[model samples]
Target: EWGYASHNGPDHWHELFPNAKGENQSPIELHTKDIRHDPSLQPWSVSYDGGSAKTILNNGKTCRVVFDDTYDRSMLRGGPLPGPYRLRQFHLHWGSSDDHGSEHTVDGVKYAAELHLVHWNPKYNTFKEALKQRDGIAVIGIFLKIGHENGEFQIFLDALDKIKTKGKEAPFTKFDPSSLFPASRDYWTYQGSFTTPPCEECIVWLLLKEPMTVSSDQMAKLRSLLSSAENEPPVPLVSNWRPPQPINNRVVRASFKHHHHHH
Candidate 1:
């Protein structure tokens, strides 16, 4: 019963939880085409020591991995932003098949999937405390567009077998996430809130206009994720994305000035 039909899609999300939208919703607008690379936005690097991957029942909802100390290296090296936020956790949201899955859209275009790198500001003593601060969290959203053949997603797909079942996790040691970035790092940034509830309106969203490409088969592996238990009826865990919301006169800025390398 916990399927996309019941609580999936933006239109139906609010219906499931009465206070899911409105003031807490983010104001995101997509550009017509991809933005070029800029050098000013350089030095985007993160080092992963890859510590023990423990499955903690997150807020009684999703199962999340509690990353260790090494998470600081990547968070600190990820360039200047609101505050020095530590890497808390990372996850993905995709479609049942491979046709569509991305969360954000550009000019009405949808991608294959979306990857979120979640971080929390150090100003707060704990992740829960940071979640309430305006500059406490920063989520970098990378779009996964489908291509002719298998591409960069091989890294993630290769590890799919390890974390196949829910509540199961394996050490992702020394994983350098920078390799996932596309050739162009030019991006659009804005102040927004987490797409999920309690929709904490304290996230600095950096959305890369240019998406990295992956093959259809790669997308298939992602859809293999389960939304519920095996005994229960099967539910496709894909397309867990929220639709674009009203801008409400908020200005979306680009990093073109700082990233002057790509013309």
Candidate 2:
């Protein structure tokens, strides 16, 4: 099984999933100096139904929450997107420690964790079909830092104990995730691929400039999740993030003007 262990980690994924070697792979370094200010980009918007959230599960790779995608009940539109994309699911990537866990870094600075809200273009009819198009998927990346307890995020942490092992899941619904969004809507966008296996080069990544806070205690609860299933030796599901891939000459676009680049 493909996992975060040394034997089956990111380094070895290309052998099985050839797309991992694609030119437009994701989780790239977001260098301020190299980013371009695109005035044409619009502010992204989300019209989500809290009741649409269905379940939270430990997939052994990361903690994931699935939502109903049958229709545009929970839709994400505008801002670099051609049309509305249905919210399918959202998940996180973290480290064993608080120092470095975020998938995409700004000026090489990593956050404690990262949250990905996965959405798919409805014009494609299905996610599988969407996966084949260049602009079929749109993912919102939110960085999580260690600071004050984010009461909004606490809902996820509170459910962790019930899903300690891989394949374990419980009811998780009526939770409007927009409550977790940062105040600043500024973002950096680029054409990229999924960070996980079958790294399809079909995503339009929108990474929020502002980071949301999570208490250290909450982080500890997240790391407490196990990659191993019940009856198996326990293994912490930490550092599940794939290292930054080569930018491959791709341009990163920014929605807000620079306050001047960070040195």
Candidate 3:
């Protein structure tokens, strides 16, 4: 139940973790057709403390990313007061191969992979308690695309060698996540739920319309990750993306002053 199975997708996620999916909540559908990209939300910064050198566990699957503060002032779209949320963990979902990756799609186009910067509302005191709040979490989604050559993603790809195996971690040490941002910060935003279990409907999703590129070799390295040590024999992890869900009449909007990118 650790990794995704063909029979059980988002619809069956609740079965694995009963409390993962919230009850009596309305499900949302994203509308990319009228998505607007805003540039005012440029520049994102994150202060991450990697913790102890021996704290690495299974390529970040079981790891914790300690966050004290962040400077995402420009990235705020629709949410409660700016002070309630704090960065919690940053993880990624990618394909086993370069052909396909990413969890969400834009106008039928799926990127090579996706990155999620998870944050929780500080009003609840603890991360666990924050999960129960309506405005508890905010997840920023970034898409990864593959092109003729590797792009400026070396900062993240370079760390693969150090965390080559599962359950093996090392001190990430003074890493600034802001270095990964593209020159443009314009994005489309909406209120949505977590792509994973507990699918809470408290999230304010800021989905970047512009995608970042990476080399094919780097994509291959990502696929090398193992889900388990059983006889599964390391299946290719490419195409780990989840198909786009029905928009369900959800209105995705843009806060930027100038909006022409998405018509």
Candidate 4:
């Protein structure tokens, strides 16, 4: 099984999943100096129903909140996408502590954590079929900074004790994920892949420039969950993030022109 452990971590993923060695890989460093300002990029829009959130689970890798994606009830559109993408699930990537956990860095700086909101193109019959296409998946990456407590995100944390071990899941509903989004929608867009196993290069990443805040204690709550199952020795689920991959020749486009623009 591909994990963040030394034996089956990100370094050894390519052996089992060939796509992990593909030309376009995700979680690349977002150097502000190297990214181009895309004035033509349109603002992205989303409509999410709190009730659409179904359950939260500890999948032995990362903590994920699954959504009801049977229809277009919750959808993402505009921006760099060709059409609307249905919201599927969202998860997190973090380190054992607060200093360096985010997969995508800003000017060589890593945040406390990163949130991935996964969506798939509905044009395809199913998410499985969409994953095969270049424009299949669209992920909204939000950086989580360590600061004031994030009440909106606490809804998931409060239920963590019930799912302390891997494969443990509990009902998680009526939670509007957008409540955790930063005020600014300006983002850096690029072509990337799934950061984890089966590392398919089918994702169009839109990483928000502004990071949302979560207190140090809130982050500790996240690390409390175990990557191991009930039958195995407990192992803290920390540093689940894959290191940044080679940028290759891909260009990163930004919605905002200036690195730190004040309006």
Candidate 5:
């Protein structure tokens, strides 16, 4: 039940999850001047199954679409990773307004939203077990902007109607997450922790540079979700995003060059 509330928010998460205060905490500021454009960085690649989606749920924090990860049906490779990382689940972090909401910011600017496609190294059997190691997980980050209606997102948007409140869930199969990716495969790579509690420093983050557009109306629909449970006093889940953490000398590398670069 760790949430973005005044009392239980990110600032207080360290009290319960020690990793929250770790040196490698996530959602770090992506200042353009600090990043390195390395040719050594590998290109981005992924192979997802359309039927890999298991269910979509509203856990009172963010809307998450769980995927089946018991096998190597889906693969997350390339980038700075050593081997294949299995796709686990994909979720989002967003704010109430169009100006700012995303967890990660580049050049001191925040976008409307951020999409996280969480993946974990297969060396550790389960996602839960993988959290303990420094190199056990790899997460793909896609920045979301407010502009044209992304037809690819419509399938995901349509399913939100059922999981309108906390604890609500429904079947969400045959949905390939790759559909939401932008036209460019350019990205930024860095070593950072998870944005949420128990913020383990086990992620080799692959953040895509190209920002994709979703209609303003679509953003409204996402804001329509609630943080409170069905029978509780309604609290609109407008802003569930975490602010950027300190850079702490971490090297943020770009897959592409200086221009049209910096993921």
Candidate 6:
């Protein structure tokens, strides 16, 4: 019932989805000055198994990479988690250009795009069931940068050519996503919500401090994707991102200390 369009866009989302106006929403700016360093917040962890990726799809919104989450084969645990959360799927958010499309920002700096690896609480029987609780989901956010081609991401980029249109999908397997991570383990953690509707406020966001790089051309390949239906007019997948919502005074904790708050 909600869409990223003029009539049903984010600005007007609150009218339809009450949670859109809820106190704790997502994709908020991670201003370097406003963060509170909590040494108690330990280093976060991510362990995605190779060969578990199932398929990639263009779902009229963005390109999504789905993984096998029937069991706790691959998951993210520790650092603000109730327990180990199962890796469900991952998706991207980008703009028409390379400067500012990411949902979360760093020190007021914007990146070309953002990556979200979604993992849900295994205690719940299903992903949908997890959405209703306070700490039901955990999303790892990694900012995107443009530079020399990162060979590790080629498999993901290659799959985009086939699923150019909405609802299109192709097999994506035997790929290890941990290979896609940056060398640094620093990150910012907070309580948030789903970036898109129905904007459930059940997420504990783990935003990686270090960013990953992809050539500009690889970015072009992603922009070439279309969000329109197979039989409909072409609609580019370049702008599938939501603007940062208010922080509502939520205590954004960082793993490392930076005595640089605006205070």
Best by TM-score: 2
Q: Candidate 6: TM-score?
A: 0.95
Which lDDT tens digits does candidate 2 get at residues 1-263?
68777898899999999999999999899998889999999989999999999999999999999999999899998999999999999999998899989999999899999999999999999999999998899999999999999998998888898999999999999998899998999999999999999999999999999999998999998999998989999888888999999998998999999866643
The lDDT for every candidate, in the order shown, is: 0.62, 0.93, 0.57, 0.92, 0.88, 0.88
Q: Residue 120 lDDT in model 3? A: 71
What tens-digit string does per-residue lDDT give for candidate 6 at 1-263? 67787898899999988899999998888887677778888776777887789999988888899999999888788888978999989999998898888988887888889999999998988888999988999999998999878898888898788899988899989888888899998889999999998899999999999899989999988899987888888888777889889888899988987755545
- Candidate 3 residues 53-144, lDDT tens each? 12223432322333444332222233323553566566677866665667776666667788777777666677677666666677777878
Model 5 whole-model lDDT (C-alpha atoms): 0.88
lDDT of 2: 0.93
Q: Write the per-residue lDDT of candidate 1 for residues 129-218, one digit (tens) a residue.
A: 877777788877888888754444575566666655554566555444556778786667667887765567787878776787777777
Model 5 bad stretches (over 4 Å): 259-263
- The clash numbers for all candidates, in the given order, read 10, 0, 15, 0, 0, 0
Query: How displaced is residue 144 in candidate 3, in Å?
Result: 1.2
Q: Which residue pairs come into collision in candidate 1?
A: 38-259, 39-259, 39-260, 39-261, 40-258, 40-259, 94-238, 94-239, 95-238, 95-239
TM-score, cand. 3 vs. native: 0.74
Give per-residue CA lDDT, model 4, range 1-263, as digits (tens): 88988899888999999999999998898888788898999999999999999999999899999999999988999999999999999999999778899999999899989999999999998999999999899999999998889888898789898899999998989988899998899999999899998999899999998899999999999999999999999899999999999999898999888947445
Candidates sorted on TM-score, descending: 2, 4, 5, 6, 1, 3
**Most lDDT-accurate candidate:** 2
Q: Give the TM-score of candidate 1.
A: 0.77
lDDT of 3 at 150: 49
Q: How many clashing residue pairs are found in candidate 3? A: 15
The lDDT, on a scale of 0 to 1, for candidate 1 is: 0.62
